Structure formats: structure tokens, C-alpha cells
């Protein structure tokens, strides 16, 4: 239930998999800053959510990839959005 | 205020001036359809007092004769005029004298009756304060005043009044309510009630006297609405093609099965006759029995009382006039023998089965008539069953098997009970064995262990948890079945629960019986009262003694029984005071038909806004590491008294906990690994005797007792169990495996562990024996999960290993050094990411509050089961502890039998259902 864009992000722009992770989510999760920037420049949904409510900013700041956080913020992202548990990318 | 009604045959509204209206006489509401009787036979069905008044007799002695025809009623008045009568003032004075000889709701009704065509309660709350009684103020309150009328389903939220009930002349919710009311008011039937008043010409059946059974009902007066009610109820008749003709019933199914239920009157007779003509064969007598049963039910429920005479017509020889004999005489003859003999020349006789085939219980189902030879039926006094507490029941033997015999002294009750019983075949309902014709009795199967009431009173030791669940589940099944057939049990009591087998895995354990008070709903019935009674019964099952020994108190606190979560909630919701909020019996059974209902021993909720990251179990009690702040708080939760305590012991968040045991000196020290890297050793006996071991370079993330310390830099430090008590103890050796790669897993079974993305093994010599790289499994799950830290390791024959923020659990063979998807299991049956594992079966606690269960052979999903899981582990009756979050912390103590018992029930119910599939 994944598209080659999913695998490219790991190693459609908003198509989701079993876990709700769109390419963006996985790009901000693994730590590929360039892939995140490419995806936002390609028209990504910086306000998307997975099956657990996490946003691309959530995974970007969840692992310490602050450069991806800045790239998302400069591209219309919401810094106060909440997850399933109500936490924000600022919280993580 | 008062209600006045015009009754009788006929000025109607002409005499009312002296359909609903208002008139002061004190103000009254007049309905033209005390009670005023306008004057000769319609007054008897009307009979609250009735006043006789002449029908404007202005057309003398004739009026007096007509009055004395019926009078020789409260009084008589000669109002002999359509207007301005001489005695009109006298009639008004008499009516005033007769009439003279929820107040808040009455006041509020004026505002209530302001609907141009539910929300009325809001109007009762906006402009009133006492109406806040709500539940206690609206139990019956409006139908008593004829305004805003409200088992009618369309009555709770429904509130044209009586004139439209208009259909006799010729909103969707309003139309549905009108249809329901017309069905209730017997104006229209779910086959009209005013079809015709002339009996249609009937077909010609067999007219032989020896071939027909004729039952006559001589009634002096016809009650009003009798025929319409009989038409409505003479429809659920079955001989196992209803060519039905309707008039003010010719129900013929076959040339040998028909009921000619009609009414008539002879020329030389002032009363009325109801005639039933049935064929005297094997099938028609069933129809006759059903028709007699329905007529008796109508004259007992709808129209109590009514002197009614029952005759049966018999002819010794064909071609002779039918001779009518009272049913009491025929019953006496059937009790004495089975032949009616002519008193004159006693040589011609006729069996009762050919005359009154309902006094000898004739034509009962083929598999049910009692064979007088096989059964013992020895109803000797003092050879009772239950010492007579079950009525007049003794013991006997039917076909070599013991049975219970109930003697019936009075034929009405036996036939009513048999008709009730012949359509109740359920695994949880006691089943009919013998009809019991000649002794006039009823024989049932026997329960060896008495009733459940006796078990709860005395034999409490043998009643285990699974036995309680099985009894309650079977009784709920029975109640649900009873309500499925629109049958209402009176009051479900422990005395009505018979126990056959005490083996917990048997298909049937408890049964419901009714051998002809405190277990009462607040409203009293209705099935909501039955659910209330079942809630009380389950309260008395969970609490073994309970209310049968002596708004309810909490069962696990008043009586001190072992806690049973998910059953106390069911009791609470069943015993809800509002009948609309009680669950239906089907829903109650589904709640009982729960795998997690039996095993869930304990459920503890921790103080609000507390975060616990790790726990350990003493061997009951639990130590917990609070992580809702930047201070190291150690909490102590007692699983018995739920005495949650906490204290600050460290300057940094406590990350891991372990328990060193020293049987040599009988010591037990809890070691706490903190974020700053300090191992805090505290004697579990007292918190004062505490110290610290050698401080680690980085955070301490895992501790195991064999004492092994895993840090955030992979520096596994080995501590001898006897040197844990040594203050500032230095480890004998340190593996130093990994890099600045946390060592977070350590398990026994040579023993193994996990750090970063590598698995290591080592023996008693404490050096690396096997190293396995777990990033080679990136083709099965992408690098977002494999490249995470390793958080859990368990072992039986292959290492089951779980990584941080990953819903995938991997399996690695311990020999060749080389796949459970939790999202798949969750979707088939919500975050998915694995937070903890444990082993016994494999238990996987995911971040969304689910606890997946797997077998250790084929990794098959058993059950998926507070919406987070932080850590699950074993403890000791072996149990499982699970900790999760809501943030409101959650502790859940299951019975480790959980993988097995929930399987049993899955088969149990099934085989039990099979019995129903065989009982139909
Ligand atoms: C000897 C005997 C005769 C009759 C019954 C009986 O109950 N029949 C019966 C009738 C009707 C109904 C259902 N109606 C519907 C609505 N009504 C308003 C309420 C109920 C039920 C149902 F069950 F469905 F409710 C059961 C039990 C025994 C027995 C026995 C026995 C067996 N074993 C034993 N061991 N020790 C003692 C002992 C005693």
C-alpha cells in the first residue's frame, strides 16, 4: 500500500499508506532535508496528518531535524497544529 | 376541573347544551360519545356512576313504563324537551350534586397545550423550578385531561386528538403516530373494525355430529369492543391456507381443520351465543384448543370477569339433536375415566377425545404426550424436589432418567403453561418432557445440584469466577431469548436459576424456571424492568451472598468480593433509573459475551496529570518511575489497597527500574536508573537505607537482575548481586559495546540483549559471544523503523525484538542470526507503533491503547483488546500488568490465562449456540 515515492522518501505527493505516512512524513522522519524541500516545492500538504495525527513538522522536530522544521515553516506550515494526543511540533 | 361524558344510545349533543367541549356547571370538560346515561341494552356494556335521563320524551304513562322496564343507574329525570325543559333545572341540580359528591403539572399544562400541530420539557424547565424533579415528576404526567396525549413506542417524544381517530368517515412523524394510535385504539387492524354487521353465507363443511366438536359460550351481555378484539387476536392461530372470512371468523386451513367462530341467538333465548365448530380429527382439535385458549385469554386479560357458560355439544348417534353438556361435567368425566356413558341404558358410550378434545390435553405435540407406562410419576408427599420450595414438585423417573413432576390440582392453568412452554426451546430454558394428562401434571428434566439460589446461600466455595461468568451468561441468553419472542419474564430471581453441571466448560450450566418483591424495577411490565432484574441478579452473582442474605452500593466495596471490572459497569448501566437508558438484553448479553470481561482482574487509575515511564513488580506491589517533570519521582502502588504513594528521590527523570534479590541475607534493593546517569539503590524495606553506585557517563536506560546496567552509550556494566548494597560500587567489568547507541534491552535465556540496531549475546564469562546487525532487515520494513533504537527483547526459541516508534516487531533466529505487523492486526480487527512486548504467548502493547495477543507457534491473532500502552510485563496466580496513558495514567491487571480462557469461550458460546440450532 505504498508508492515508489514512499520508498524514495525512506531511502502522488499526499497519498497515504497503512500508517498514514505520505512521502513528506517519511522524508521528515528519516532526515532527508533535501527531499522535504523538494516535496514542499512540488506542492506538498504541510498540514497533513497520519493515523496518529502527526504532521510533517511533528516528525521533523520529533528527531531534531530543525532544518526541515525551518523549511516547512517557510512554506506555509502551521507550527501550532495538534496530533491525536494534542501535542504540537513545538512540544516535541 | 372534572370530566363528564355522555353515554347511552338519543339526543346526543341536543341534550348536552343543558367531540370535546368545555362547560361550567366549577368547570367541566364534556365529551359526547359523572357520566350521563340518556335513555335499553347499550348501558350494560357501559358499566363512574350513570344518571338515567329521558330522551326528550315530548312525543306520560309510556315514559314511566319505559323507565321501569330497565330501572325496575343513580337516578331518573324526565327532561322531556329538546330545549327549555321543565326538569332541565332538576337535571342540572342532580348533576351538580353528583359531581360535587400533580397540581404543578396541571398549572403547566396550559402552557404545554400550545403546539400548533419532546421540547416541552424545556418549556417545563425555562419557566419552572420544581419541575427539576424531571425523573420523579414525569412518570405519568396530560392523558388524564384529554390534551397532549403521550407498549407504544411513539409516545416518549410524541405529543387530531380524538376527532381524527375521521378515518371512519371514508407530517411523517404525525402520520406514523396516527397509524400506531389507530392500531392501539383498535380502529384499524394489521390484517378495519367496522367492516359489516351481517354474517356472510358460509361454505358447507362436514355436518356429521360424530365428526364435529361444537363449543358454545352463553354470555348474557356482549361487552363493547369484544368482537373487534376477538377478530384481532384470532389471527395467530396455527395447526402446526387461512381462507379467512371476516364479520362482526371462518378460519379454515383445510377440509379437516377449521374454526367457525361465530355469534348468534336463538328465537327463544334472551342471551347471546358464541359458537366454535371444529372437526373432530387429529388436526382440528389443535385449532379448537388454540381458539379456546385465545378466547379465555381475551376474557381474562382484556375483559376480566364475565355468568358466562361453556357448553359442549355431543350426540350419541348421528341424525339426533345435539345435547349440550356443561364443561364441568365433562371435566369430571375425563378425570374419572375416558368414556361418557348414557345414564339410560348404559351401553352406548363416547370417548372424551371425541367430544371435548381439550380436557384430556388431547392433540398435544407428538413427542410430548406422557406415556403412562414408562414414567413413574410417583407424586408421594415428602418425596419432594427442593422440599417443596419449587411448588408442588416431586421426583420421578420417565425413561430410566430422573425427572421432576408438578401436580396440577383448574385445567386452565395447565393449558396456559403448556401453551407458553411449547414455543420456548432454548439451551437456557428448562425444556418440556412429558405432558402429564391423566394425573393432570407436568414433567420436566431434573437439575441435580438444586437451584442457584441454594448454591449462593450455602455452597459458595465451589463457585469460581468462570462458573459465575457462565451462569450469568446463560441466564442473559435466556432473558434475551424471552424478549426476542416478545415474552416478558415477571421477575428474574436466583430461585429461578437451576444448576445442572458445576463443570465450568460444560455447554449448559444454568437454566431458567417459572414454577407458577426485592427484584423489582423502580417503575414497577416492560423489558427494561427485566434488564433491571438481570442487573440485580448479576449483582448477586458477582457478589455471591449479596442481597439474598442481607441505589445499590458498589459490589466490590460493600461486600469485599474480588474486583471484576467490566461487570460492575454492566450492573451500573442495567440498574439505571431511566428505563430508556438501560441497555437492551441483547446488548447486555453482548457485554457479557466478552473475552476481556473474565480475565480483567484489576483496573487502577492514577492521579490526574501524572506520567509514568517504567515500573517493576515486587515478589503484591509495584514501583513506578514518574516522568511528568524534571525531578526523579519514585511511586509505590499497592495492588491490594490501591494505595498510590510517591516521593522525589532523584534530581533527574527516572528512566528504568530493577529489583536485586539477595536470599543470602534476605535483601531486596530497587535500583533506579536516571537521566543524569545515577544509579539510586534503595532498600525496598525502607527508603532511608539508600545510596548510589558508580555514576555512569550517560543516561541509564535499562536494568536487569540476574545486576546488569545498560547506559545510553552502550556501556553494559556488570554488578554482582551482593555488591549492589555496596555504596559507590564499581562494576567488575564493562562490555563497552556500541558508541555514543543506547543499550536498552537485556533478557535471560547465556543471556542476550539489544543496543542501537545490534543484538548481542554473552555467557557467564561476560564477553561478546554473538553480534547481529538488525539494519539488514530494511527490505521488510523501511528505514524509518529499522534504523530506530531497540526497546524490547524476549526469547523462547527465537529473539522477538521491538524497536522504538515502530509498529513492526521482528523475529531473529538465535542460530542463523536472521516480522509481526501490528497495523495489519489493528486494521483487520489507533497509532500502531509498538511500545512494549512481553512473553509467557506474545503480548504486544501498542501506543494507541491496544494489546495484541499472539500464539508462539503460528503468530496467530487471538484478541486485539485508556488509549495508550507504556509498558506491560508479568507478575505474581500469574498476572499481567499493563501501563498506559489517557494525561491520566492507567494500570490494567489481566489474568495470564487470557490467551486460553478467551479461546474457550469462543468455542463455548459456539457449541451452546449449536444447541439452539438443534432446538429451533
Ligand atoms: C416441574 C416444572 C414445571 C414447570 C417449570 C417451568 O418453569 N415452566 C415454564 C413456563 C413458562 C416460562 C416462560 N414464562 C413466560 C412469561 N412468564 C411470565 C414467565 C415465564 C418458563 C421460562 F423458564 F421460560 F421462564 C418456564 C419448571 C419445572 C421444574 C423444575 C426443576 C428442575 N430441576 C430441579 N432441581 N432442583 C429442583 C428442580 C426443579
Residue numbers in the entry:
A (entry chain B): 49 to 59, 74 to 154
B (entry chain A): 1334 to 1342, 1345 to 1353, 1372 to 1378, 1388 to 1395, 1414 to 1419, 1428 to 1435, 1445 to 1456, 1459 to 1471, ...
Sentences from the paper on this structure:
Its N-terminal half is composed of armadillo (ARM), ankyrin (ANK), and leucine-rich (LRR) repeat domains, while its C-terminal half contains two catalytic domains, a guanosine triphosphatase (GTPase) (Ras of complex or ROC) and a Ser/Thr kinase, as well as two architectural domains, a C-terminal of ROC (COR) between the GTPase and the kinase and a WD40 domain at the end. We present cryo-EM structures of LRRK2RCKW, WT, and carrying the PD-linked mutations G2019S and I2020T, bound to the LRRK2-specific type I inhibitor MLi-2 or the broad-spectrum type II inhibitor GZD-824.
Although all three structures assumed a DYG “out”, αC “out” conformation with a broken R-spine and a disordered activation loop, the WT cryo-EM map showed a closer distance between K1906 and E1920. The G-loop adopted slightly different conformations in our LRRK2RCKW(WT):GZD-824 and LRRK2RCKW(G2019S):GZD-824 structures and this could, in principle, have an effect on H1998, which is close to the G-loop in its “up” rotamer. The caveat, which we noted earlier, is that the cryo-EM map for I2020T was of lower resolution and more anisotropic than those for WT and G2019S, so it is not possible at this point to rule out the possibility that the conformation of the G-loop was responsible for the difference between WT and G2019S mutant. While our structures of LRRK2RCKW:MLi-2 showed the kinase in a fully closed/active-like state, as would be expected from a type I inhibitor, the kinase in LRRK2(I2020T):MLi-2 was only partially closed, with its αC “out” and a disordered activation loop. We did not see this difference between LRRK2(I2020T):GZD-824 and LRRK2RCKW(I2020T):GZD-824; the kinases in the two structures, in an inactive/open conformation, were almost identical.
